[PDB]
Design an enzyme around this catalytic site. Structure first.
Site, PDB file in Angstrom:
ATOM      1  N   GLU A 212     -16.390 -22.452  -2.622  1.00  0.00           N
ATOM      2  CA  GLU A 212     -15.839 -21.309  -1.905  1.00  0.00           C
ATOM      3  C   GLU A 212     -14.691 -21.772  -1.044  1.00  0.00           C
ATOM      4  OE1 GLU A 212     -18.779 -19.350   0.484  1.00  0.00           O
ATOM      5  OE2 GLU A 212     -17.309 -17.886   1.291  1.00  0.00           O
ATOM      6  N   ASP A 214     -12.678 -20.335   1.812  1.00  0.00           N
ATOM      7  CA  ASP A 214     -12.475 -19.237   2.787  1.00  0.00           C
ATOM      8  C   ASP A 214     -11.091 -19.318   3.409  1.00  0.00           C
ATOM      9  OD1 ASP A 214     -14.972 -17.975   2.433  1.00  0.00           O
ATOM     10  OD2 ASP A 214     -15.917 -19.643   3.503  1.00  0.00           O
ATOM     11  N   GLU A 217     -11.445 -15.737   7.341  1.00  0.00           N
ATOM     12  CA  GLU A 217     -12.603 -14.998   7.885  1.00  0.00           C
ATOM     13  C   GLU A 217     -12.246 -14.690   9.319  1.00  0.00           C
ATOM     14  OE1 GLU A 217     -15.502 -18.137   6.537  1.00  0.00           O
ATOM     15  OE2 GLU A 217     -16.676 -16.254   6.179  1.00  0.00           O
ATOM     16  N   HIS A 228     -15.408 -25.090   1.337  1.00  0.00           N
ATOM     17  CA  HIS A 228     -16.848 -25.408   1.141  1.00  0.00           C
ATOM     18  C   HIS A 228     -16.993 -26.000  -0.244  1.00  0.00           C
ATOM     19  CE1 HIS A 228     -18.457 -22.675   4.403  1.00  0.00           C
ATOM     20  NE2 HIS A 228     -17.315 -22.060   4.170  1.00  0.00           N
TER      21      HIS A 228
END
Ligand SMILES: *[C@@H]1O[C@H](CO)[C@@H](O)[C@H](O)[C@H]1NC(C)=O
Ligand SMILES: *[C@@H]1O[C@H](CO)[C@@H](O)[C@H](O)[C@H]1NC(C)=O
Ligand SMILES: *[C@@H]1O[C@H](CO)[C@@H](O)[C@H](O)[C@H]1NC(C)=O
Ligand SMILES: [Gd+3]
Length: 432
Positions: A212, A214, A217, A228
């Site tokens: 993932e 990101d 966010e 991640h």
């Protein structure tokens, strides 16, 4: 699961720009699709619910295979049920929408065709978008991110899934989510535990893990950038407590890094960089441009544009690290100063480069957090620590303002708008 058509499925269109190192950008016409978990799941030949409230039908869904044979996903009324609209290059996601039931937020994928997700190869490229976070208070997360999902929603690997990407199947992320009702063309009813604090959700016996990225966010108070890694790069089912992530007793107990190597400027001590109003460098009451470059080393570069003024990611000093790039030195210094080993144990930026060298799917979402109340993003966290604990303070929000019952009743018309997506080689997204 299969697909039903009691409600027609019309994917809201969304344009975006694909940019070239040759000095131009060209408009692409895509569309977005809501994740299958948001949909009505019912019998293939009647309006009888397979899932309702937060429990499954015992007769339709006695086990994972039987449920998938008996049940179908239906279409979505995007605006009236989910508060999702598009307007040319702009996507608006609303927070609470009360129709016959309560809907909270949405998670949407960018499509390349009716039956396939758009895949992006991030490594050596850059991704730009504009965002209005002005209507996102403490406790909410308007997220734009990439996951290593299959392009077809899982159909070729799990042929018992015939609904596919057309109906938003196939989700995975670094939290190894167990709240998914269908994984790998089977239901997730086996071991299903209804959420004690959420009448619409639960946790099943399986989860769906993958890498993932990101990119974003954020809300009006705080924002974070976080890769991640996972030990298996792409989508993989996990079992029970072995999943780790948000939905297991031990979050660190699986194959993915649920924490990541995060860069939140407020957390790093730049507390006047991003926030509401004139005392901040980036004023979150107004629209912002966010640009993210995936450098070939595996490092990540970030800059912002607001009202025609460009701001690079602010410098941080953390231990022996000094600089403004999310790189190996930063991530090493972060684990040393703030603690943790999940990012490096899962292979760090080197393992992460395996995800970004492959294809990833663009996800846009808005959510509140029934597990940690978004305090990791915009407050002091973990909540057994104090302000004096290094890295504990991530924003100015109170402990209780992100409790779902609070934010859903106080700020139901919260929303996020993502717009003007541009993608191409490093240095190309400023092209006309
Ligand atoms: C509906 O489909 C199921 C199989 O999923 C079947 O067993 C059931 O009898 C059907 N309903 C009828 C015939 O009314
Ligand atoms: C925060 O960042 C901005 C960079 O845009 C800078 O003007 C300001 O000096 C920084 N404040 C810190 C590091 O405390
Ligand atoms: C806070 O809790 C964590 C684990 O839940 C533990 O590692 C840490 O030592 C605790 N710190 C304090 C100051 O209580
Ligand atoms: Gd550089």
């Amino acid at each position: 699961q299969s697909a039903c058509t009691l409600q027609s499925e019309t994917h809201p269109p969304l344009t975006w720009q694909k940019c070239s190192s040759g000095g131009t950008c060209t408009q692409q016409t895509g569309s977005v699709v809501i994740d299958a978990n948001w949909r009505w799941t019912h019998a293939t030949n009647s309006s009888t619910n397979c899932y309702d409230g937060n429990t499954w039908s015992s007769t339709l869904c006695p086990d994972n295979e039987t449920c998938a044979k008996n049940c179908c996903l239906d279409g979505a009324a995007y605006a009236s049920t989910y508060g999702v609209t598009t307007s040319g290059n702009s996507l608006s996601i609303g927070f609470v929408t009360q129709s016959a039931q309560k809907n909270v937020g949405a998670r949407l994928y960018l499509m390349a065709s009716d039956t396939t997700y758009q895949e992006f190869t991030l490594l050596g490229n850059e991704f730009s978008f504009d965002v209005d976070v002005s209507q996102l208070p403490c406790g909410l997360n308007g997220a734009l991110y990439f996951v290593s999902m299959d392009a077809d929603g899982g159909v070729s690997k799990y042929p018992t899934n015939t609904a596919g990407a057309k109906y938003g199947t196939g989700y995975c992320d670094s939290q190894c989510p167990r709240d998914l009702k269908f994984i790998n063309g089977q239901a997730n009813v086996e071991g299903w535990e209804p959420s004690s604090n959420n009448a619409n959700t639960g946790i099943g016996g399986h989860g769906s893990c993958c890498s993932e990225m990101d990119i974003w966010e954020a809300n009006s108070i705080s924002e974070a950038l976080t890769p991640h890694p996972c030990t298996t790069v792409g989508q993989e089912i996990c079992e029970g407590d072995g999943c780790g992530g948000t939905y297991s007793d031990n979050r660190y107990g699986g194959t993915c890094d649920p924490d990541g190597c995060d860069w939140n400027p407020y957390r790093l001590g730049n507390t006047s960089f991003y926030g509401p109003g004139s005392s901040f460098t980036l004023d979150t009451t107004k629209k912002l441009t966010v640009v993210t470059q995936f450098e070939t080393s595996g490092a990540i570069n970030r800059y912002y544009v607001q009202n025609g003024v460009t701001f690079q990611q602010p410098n941080a000093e953390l231990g022996s690290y000094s600089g403004n790039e999310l790189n190996d030195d930063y991530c090493t210094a972060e684990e040393a100063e703030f603690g943790g080993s999940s990012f490096s144990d899962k292979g760090g930026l080197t393992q992460f480069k395996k995800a970004t060298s492959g294809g990833m799917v663009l996800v846009m979402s808005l959510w509140d957090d029934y597990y940690a109340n978004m305090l990791w993003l915009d407050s002091t966290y973990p909540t057994n620590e104090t302000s004096s604990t290094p890295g504990a303070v991530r924003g100015s929000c109170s402990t209780s303002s992100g409790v779902p019952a609070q934010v859903e009743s106080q700020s139901p018309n919260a929303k996020v708008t993502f717009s003007n997506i541009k993608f191409g080689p490093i240095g190309s997204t400023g092209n006309p």
